[PDB]
Design a protein around this ligand. Sequence first.
Ligand SMILES: O=C(O)[C@@](O)(COP(=O)(O)O)[C@H](O)[C@H](O)COP(=O)(O)O
Ligand SMILES: O=C(O)[C@@](O)(COP(=O)(O)O)[C@H](O)[C@H](O)COP(=O)(O)O
Ligand SMILES: [Mg+2]
Ligand SMILES: [Mg+2]
Ligand SMILES: [Mg+2]
Ligand SMILES: [Mg+2]
Lengths: 468, 468, 158, 153
Amino acid sequence: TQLIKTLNIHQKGYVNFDLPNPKNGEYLLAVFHLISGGKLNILQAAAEVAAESSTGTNFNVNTETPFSKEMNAVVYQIDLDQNLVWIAYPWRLFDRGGNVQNILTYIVGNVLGMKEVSALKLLDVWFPPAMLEQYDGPSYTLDDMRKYLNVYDRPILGTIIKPKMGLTSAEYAEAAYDFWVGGGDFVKNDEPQANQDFCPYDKMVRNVKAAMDKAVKETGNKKVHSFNVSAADFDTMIERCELIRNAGFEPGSYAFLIDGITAGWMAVQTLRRKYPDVFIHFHRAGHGSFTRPENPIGFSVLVLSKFARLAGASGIHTGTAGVGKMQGSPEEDVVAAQNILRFKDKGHFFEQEWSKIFEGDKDAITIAQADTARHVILEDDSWRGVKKCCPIISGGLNPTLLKPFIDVMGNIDFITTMGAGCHAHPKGTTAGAKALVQACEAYQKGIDIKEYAKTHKELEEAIEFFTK
Amino acid sequence: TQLIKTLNIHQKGYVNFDLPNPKNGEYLLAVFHLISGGKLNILQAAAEVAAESSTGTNFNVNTETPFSKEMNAVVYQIDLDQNLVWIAYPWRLFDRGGNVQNILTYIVGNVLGMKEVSALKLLDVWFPPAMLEQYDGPSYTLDDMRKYLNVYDRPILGTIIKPKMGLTSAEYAEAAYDFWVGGGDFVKNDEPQANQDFCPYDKMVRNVKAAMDKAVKETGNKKVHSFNVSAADFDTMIERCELIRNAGFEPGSYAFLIDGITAGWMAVQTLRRKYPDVFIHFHRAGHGSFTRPENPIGFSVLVLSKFARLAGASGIHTGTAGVGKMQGSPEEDVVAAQNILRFKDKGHFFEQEWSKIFEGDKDAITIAQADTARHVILEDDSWRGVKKCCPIISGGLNPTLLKPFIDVMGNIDFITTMGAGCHAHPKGTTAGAKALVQACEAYQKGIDIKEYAKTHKELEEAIEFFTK
Amino acid sequence: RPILGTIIKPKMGLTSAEYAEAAYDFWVGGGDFVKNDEPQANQDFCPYDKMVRNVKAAMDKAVKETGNKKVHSFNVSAADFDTMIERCELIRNAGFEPGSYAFLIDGITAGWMAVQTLRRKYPDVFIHFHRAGHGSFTRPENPIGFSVLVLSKFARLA
Amino acid sequence: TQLIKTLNIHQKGYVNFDLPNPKNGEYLLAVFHLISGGKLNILQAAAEVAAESSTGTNFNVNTETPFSKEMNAVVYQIDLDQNLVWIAYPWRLFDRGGNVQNILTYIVGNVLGMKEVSALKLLDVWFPPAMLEQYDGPSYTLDDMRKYLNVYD
Ligand SMILES: O=C(O)[C@@](O)(COP(=O)(O)O)[C@H](O)[C@H](O)COP(=O)(O)O
Ligand SMILES: O=C(O)[C@@](O)(COP(=O)(O)O)[C@H](O)[C@H](O)COP(=O)(O)O
Ligand SMILES: [Mg+2]
Ligand SMILES: [Mg+2]
Ligand SMILES: [Mg+2]
Ligand SMILES: [Mg+2]
């Protein structure tokens, strides 16, 4: 009321507390933690943020048409105690053809640089079904990799080949084989692993193909390697992708890892569209400045995961919820993982149903019940909703912390990669992989890891090394 | 000394205070503001940051080869009062072929997410000449656009067509013509301006071509439009680029604008390599979470500008140094602009010469003296050094603030775009452009804007509107 | 007068820009001929294409400044034929003035087949026979081998 | 010691007897039987050979960068009785793409023609695994021909 009266003529055009239905399908919804930078109240700063993020500037321009005002972002709700502002963005503003970076430019672009706000954090977003129809979403999912690996009822066990850099193609392939033949299913390139002169990319791909062939023949179990395809340009990325394709691995045995933050959302969308049959591994390296709680300006991990799911990433790192070495808590990481893995989640502020069909459809209710029961959904009915994005759990994880994270995760529908958790095991990479599989089996059987390690030497050695 | 003794075996491998020559060409140099997250001193947290950013993890992995330890990032200097840590990264770690996002993944990637640090801000970086040889740098520069525009001895005057979104192709072209025929040289797409359904991209390009043709014929002066080519994927971006190319504009009359942060560094490098003859307009929308001083985790504006120059961007927004609406001060913005515009700058912590030749070369000294004298350098001798990256000054700027920013800028070698400074002028876009040109002429003649506006109605109206 | 030439020292370790700068420094100082050192190739710190482009720019600058033509001898010895011809075509499509570039081949290490292939594919290009490794054949301290005269005669025949 | 003190400034950049790990993977190792050709001792001749076979000449050139010194071949060991010199060549010097004749041009190229040495025989070389990854190696082997011929034992 009073804050509305404090608004000038320009700011009033971007504030509508009497918006009749924010969830009518015309508006993406964004909740911002907002603290003004000085001399502006919360509502004035929110109006400036909405103008700078939809259509306007610090002033009313004389070129403003009545049609332009329809595209205005409007503040439709404010919590004064929490400093929360809700903004409805007409998704007509966004670039057509499922352009996610255009959305990020609108909502988490210039507004982060504004001195009018001392804190601007996009906590959550809500995608209407009409807007959700515009975007690709995932095409390859965790269920497809589960089918390829024949891994069900447990998290897909993965590793990151440590050292991060400095190994040759032969050494990297040897480490990948050592993890694979030890029982591990998933091996990923470290995020900066690329065509370095001491580890050439084609040699690395060929050696990884040979190592995976040997591991598959020895264990009788399929294996998956996630190749980092982040390059200087598109041509190098697609050349590396085609090099992986023409190796040639079995279909499903390789995933395309892209550094989403650094390489860009364009690279993620290009990989998703060019290779819909390949698991797109979204690596979120560099996300911290956006998502760290110490940083007042940015967007939450939940928003990043939601936009990664929208962009078509098959999976994205979500965080260990403070169990690992990455910041910082379960309330962000587990919530984001549930939101990207579930057909419907809470989440932080918006009830996000990833269905693209009518709200009260009986088939939608059946799909939600099946998704809650952990059955595969959207296989023959992919039009109904967005496919799930697989959470990927990494960062300072050893087998001893496998059970606690699941205790925070609430489920086992995720890929877990442990670089130092296995390669820093005193008895080698294969011993670390065996210890990880032993910890997973102990969790599956309900046996405590200390009790389980009495008959499993690798698990006991991992507990002894990783407890100090 | 004591902090070195506090280090364990793993951390000692990433700390070398006795590094004999950090500037030997083997190491990129990075200065980090670092505050530990808890239970770790400054040296321990710096060692973890260096390990996580070069080769290692929280532990020593048994796969580590002696060759791997050579690629270790080493902390070679620490200021305890300022909480500053210097890390030398062997640039052998970085992906070959001039991949900049690989560098960003190494140095400002995973380390931002580490809970071991409560503050981690990359304040500055230093590129050795041997490393600088590996990267493209700019190919089209501000000097080429100055030659095309026939604009010398004053900043290139530019505008952003406000409203940011909501105008049709005809209205946008009309606003661009109104600025161009008013004396303004440069018109840019707003950062999210793309193929929206109400402003189709091909229609916008054709209408902008017609408007620029009309403005060029009426004024007898060439004009430049910067088109936003940020798309969902590479194919859409190149389709829009080719659409601009086959419009067909005069060569030099169009620039390719890319949202570098959101669309990604891969898009910037791809635009640089595919179109070296086109001004690559780096728009840094979303940079704030990286660069805002309120955010303890990220990298400085200077580092972003330096990496944009390395990636081949012809120009990048640098900030109004607190004069405009964007945060927040001259010490970051002006320093970054000088570092990307000069052949050699201070800068924050490293003396960065952008020459790729011997440090004491007489020709290098002559080139530096010519660059200080504002002569065009590196035309016939582009091997010698990296071409300058033009600073672009935008954000809450009206003509009344044109003189003060130059007072902080120390030069007029920049493109200045004013969206609300001209389109919010009460007498229209052409009146705003005339007021901006009048303010520029008043600065060039030393006449105060209040004195100059007595014989120039547009400048007086702009002052009256923008002084309150 | 003899054609004045130089070899860019250091032999290795210079970037493409530093190499082109040294070549320009010799060229603008009155020197006519600049050659790749015999192992100078597509090293990671001095990429071959960047070296060729920078040498082309430096030769252009020296030619305009001095008003005299300049010649650079590029080492085209590679691992295989395909790499050698790729480097040769990279030199040709730089594109230098015809006669301003010579092809340097390590005739002993790379082999006589490389020398003959360079001669037959590029008869209009000066074939620079570098004889690195010849000493074991030609050193007087070595009782087994062949004289320098024999090596020169077979080079001229090839 | 005394041979180290006999060296000049130029030769000292190609002699490092305190090389910490010659087998760290950065260096191809070469052992040379070396007898100097007159007025140079074993260490000076070895330094000249290392300079001529990695980056240097008979003098210090003014174009030498600090990066260039990182590519210097260094004599890291000497057997005075056997006239043996160990030189660590950073394999960064070698042409990329598995170029073997480039390696031979470096190590057994110009140095054979030097008059500063009266005997220069490369007895042995050691390839680090990181260097060995760069090169092809045999693809068809004696085992393949044994399988084709059905000839074993
Ligand atoms: O390099 C690394 O740090 C990791 O490989 C983990 O290594 P360790 O498991 O051996 O520690 C992961 O890439 C990061 O955890 C990603 O972070 P996030 O999951 O938060 O996106
Ligand atoms: O939408 C905007 O906010 C602007 O068009 C400025 O508009 P006005 O000039 O009309 O205010 C610019 O894109 C930002 O300033 C970029 O910020 P930076 O220069 O810091 O990268
Ligand atoms: Mg990693
Ligand atoms: Mg139904
Ligand atoms: Mg010079
Ligand atoms: Mg030579």
